Every structure is written in structure tokens, then in C-alpha cells.
């Protein structure tokens, strides 16, 4: 069988660490999650291939760290499967470099490795963040209050289609240069909470979520992520409006933060009307 | 699927490079080499496994 969802087989040689999956485009975090007429792997997928990739490959926890990840192209699965790898570059610092990439199937030319995500990863100690009082937090984002009907019809408008796997928004709750959106595992998906660290199905809402702060493409970055805590069925999404950049943290429903990320930034592009 | 019928996953880490095997008795190579009552892996195997392994 399949080591993990995104990590379907291990590649390893001599040369690199590796980590090898076909996609389909059947799995629910591609027919759910539709960009543009395309079924698109959602960002938040590559730190958990990254994620598990390390765990694999250190003999597997928590206090992991992410720096400095980018994401440079959409890895589209179309009518053929798609063959995609992870490399691995340990470095004498305590550091792994990790490289995300897919085959092309260049008819007419040679086969070339297209890259879609790049980042650092440390293993560091977790640190002790204070709780959020979700109370205080809902008073200050009191401005207006977004229905997941209204989030996933201004979606679908955008050319945005969430599947049920993919809509885990239940509301947002806007303030002044943040927003707390309240995220639930779809009831679709919940069966497979336990196979995925950073579950793309709730971490994609969490950037979903990054629509209430009132068009963002790739290539996307992270300064900074930091995995606390295991994700909950039911959580919370703190973005706050910090260049173009905005952090994020997702909390379970207590207010405990169970994952800290530091500095998104998207390209910005013109709306159109 | 197996890579090899003596190295049916690759388990490599950071620390060592690694295959791995489940061997059960029904492959020829056990059922048809029994030494003492006991299916027992042939010397030859080990060299072919090597052999797999660093291809």
C-alpha cells in the first residue's frame, strides 16, 4: 500500500532521499478542489508531503519548523495521472532542504521535472504560545459575518470550485486587518482525519479563509510555519493583515494555537470588474 | 507492486539506504528449498538481494 496519501512510495538511492506518487485526480484533494476548470493539488498539501516526507525519513515530531517555502507552479491532473516525487537534502546544520516536483509529458521532447514547491524544514523545540481567548477575538471581529454559502458562492464566481472536501469554512468573522474564521472537517473527510498531520482539508480553509481580508496567485511564499500542536475536527483561523504579507494561525477550539504560520505572500494581480 | 521478488519496498532513510522484504514460505525460493525440515533462504538469494539492492 501507500506509506501516506502523498507519499505513495519510497525512491530513495544512493544520490537523495526520495519520495514517489501518482496522482489521479480521483483523490478527494483534487476532485474537490477545482481552479479554473483544472483540478489543482491545494497548496497546503506540499507541507504535508514535505511533513510526512521528513517523518519517513528521520525514522518516524512535534516542534517542526518551515522556512522560507515557496510555491512556484500548479501541479494540474488531468486526464493522466500526474508522477510526482520529493527530494530530500539533508544539510550539517540540522537543516532539510526539500524540493517538490512533477514529470512532464512533453510529447515530441524529453521528459523534464516541472518544480512546484520548494522550502527549509528544522527540527526545533516547540514554543510555549499563549492561548487566544476566542471570546475577545470574536468581539473585535465584529464588523460582519460571512456565511460558508456566501465564502463558496464568491468562490464558484471566481472560478474557485470547492468540493465538500474542500469546504471547510463554516463562517468568518471580519474585523480590522484580520479575520477569525471558524473551520470544521468536512463530515466527507473525518473518517481520514488520522492519516494526515496537517490535513489539506482544513489547512486549505485556513488559506481560504485569507478572502476576508476584503486577486492573490502564484508564485506563493512562507516565511515561517510552526507545527505546535495535532490538528482538531473543529478549529480556528486567526489571519491578521500584517509588504503583502499576512499570518495565519490555526487554533483548536479552546483558542490553543496547533499551528503558527508567519508571512504568506501571494503575487497581486488586478481584479477584474 | 514489488520491486524485486527479494526486495519488495524500498525503506531507505537520512541515517542508511534499505529494502525490505515479508518473506511468507510460498515463494519457490523457500517452499522448494527445504534444509532439515525448515524452508530456508538458499546462499545464492543473498547475493542476487545484494546485487538488486545496489542496481
Same mark, same amino acid.
Given at each position: 500500500g501507500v506509506i501516506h496519501p502523498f507519499l505513495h512510495q519510497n525512491t530513495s538511492d544512493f544520490m537523495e532521499q526520495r519520495f514517489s506518487s501518482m496522482f489521479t485526480g480521483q483523490e478527494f484533494f483534487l476532485s474537490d478542489h477545482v481552479i479554473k476548470?483544472?483540478?489543482?493539488?491545494?497548496? *497546503? *498539501?506540499?507541507? =504535508?508531503?514535505?511533513?510526512?516526507?521528513?517523518?519517513?525519513a528521520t525514522?518516524?515530531?512535534?516542534?517542526?519548523?518551515?522556512? @522560507?517555502?515557496?510555491?512556484?507552479?500548479?501541479?494540474?491532473v488531468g486526464p493522466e495521472p500526474?508522477?510526482?516525487?520529493? =527530494?530530500?537534502?539533508?544539510?550539517? @546544520?540540522? =537543516?532539510?532542504?526539500?524540493?517538490?516536483?512533477?514529470?512532464?509529458?512533453?510529447?515530441?521532447?524529453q521528459t523534464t521535472e516541472?518544480?512546484?514547491?520548494?522550502g527549509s524544514a528544522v527540527l526545533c523545540s516547540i514554543p510555549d504560545i499563549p492561548s487566544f481567548d476566542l471570546s475577545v477575538l470574536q468581539e473585535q471581529?465584529?464588523?460582519?459575518?460571512?456565511?460558508?454559502?456566501?465564502?463558496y458562492d464568491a468562490f464558484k464566481k471566481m472560478g474557485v470550485d470547492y468540493g465538500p472536501a474542500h469546504r471547510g469554512i463554516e463562517q468568518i468573522l471580519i474585523g480590522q486587518e484580520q479575520v477569525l474564521a471558524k473551520l470544521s472537517l468536512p463530515s466527507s473527510v473525518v473518517k481520514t482525519q488520522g492519516q494526515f498531520g496537517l490535513h489539506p482539508s482544513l489547512l486549505?480553509?485556513?488559506?481560504?479563509?485569507?478572502?476576508?481580508?476584503?486577486?492573490?496567485?502564484?508564485?506563493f511564499a512562507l516565511e515561517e510555519?510552526?507545527?505546535?500542536?495535532?490538528?482538531?475536527s473543529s478549529m480556528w483561523a486567526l489571519i491578521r493583515?500584517?509588504?503583502?504579507?499576512?499570518?495565519?494561525?490555526?487554533c483548536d477550539e479552546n483558542g490553543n494555537v496547533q499551528v503558527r504560520m508567519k508571512g504568506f505572500s501571494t503575487r497581486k494581480i488586478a481584479n477584474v470588474s
Amino acid at each position: 500500500g501507500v506509506i501516506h496519501p502523498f507519499l505513495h512510495q519510497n525512491t530513495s538511492d544512493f544520490m537523495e532521499q526520495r519520495f514517489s506518487s501518482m496522482f489521479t485526480g480521483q483523490e478527494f484533494f483534487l476532485s474537490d478542489h477545482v481552479i479554473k476548470g483544472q483540478r489543482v493539488l491545494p497548496s *497546503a *498539501a506540499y507541507l =504535508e508531503m514535505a511533513r510526512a516526507a521528513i517523518q519517513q525519513a528521520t525514522g518516524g515530531l512535534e516542534g517542526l519548523r518551515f522556512k @522560507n517555502v515557496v510555491w512556484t507552479q500548479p501541479l494540474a491532473v488531468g486526464p493522466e495521472p500526474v508522477q510526482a516525487h520529493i =527530494e530530500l537534502y539533508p544539510e550539517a @546544520n540540522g =537543516e532539510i532542504v526539500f524540493e517538490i516536483y512533477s514529470d512532464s509529458k512533453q510529447d515530441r521532447d524529453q521528459t523534464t521535472e516541472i518544480v512546484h514547491s520548494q522550502g527549509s524544514a528544522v527540527l526545533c523545540s516547540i514554543p510555549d504560545i499563549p492561548s487566544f481567548d476566542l471570546s475577545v477575538l470574536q468581539e473585535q471581529c465584529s464588523l460582519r459575518t460571512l456565511s460558508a454559502e456566501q465564502c463558496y458562492d464568491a468562490f464558484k464566481k471566481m472560478g474557485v470550485d470547492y468540493g465538500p472536501a474542500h469546504r471547510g469554512i463554516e463562517q468568518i468573522l471580519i474585523g480590522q486587518e484580520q479575520v477569525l474564521a471558524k473551520l470544521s472537517l468536512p463530515s466527507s473527510v473525518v473518517k481520514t482525519q488520522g492519516q494526515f498531520g496537517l490535513h489539506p482539508s482544513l489547512l486549505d480553509a485556513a488559506l481560504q479563509s485569507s478572502l476576508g481580508l476584503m486577486s492573490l496567485i502564484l508564485p506563493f511564499a512562507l516565511e515561517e510555519m510552526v507545527i505546535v500542536g495535532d490538528c482538531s475536527s473543529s478549529m480556528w483561523a486567526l489571519i491578521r493583515y500584517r509588504v503583502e504579507k499576512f499570518d495565519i494561525d490555526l487554533c483548536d477550539e479552546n483558542g490553543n494555537v496547533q499551528v503558527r504560520m508567519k508571512g504568506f505572500s501571494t503575487r497581486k494581480i488586478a481584479n477584474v470588474s
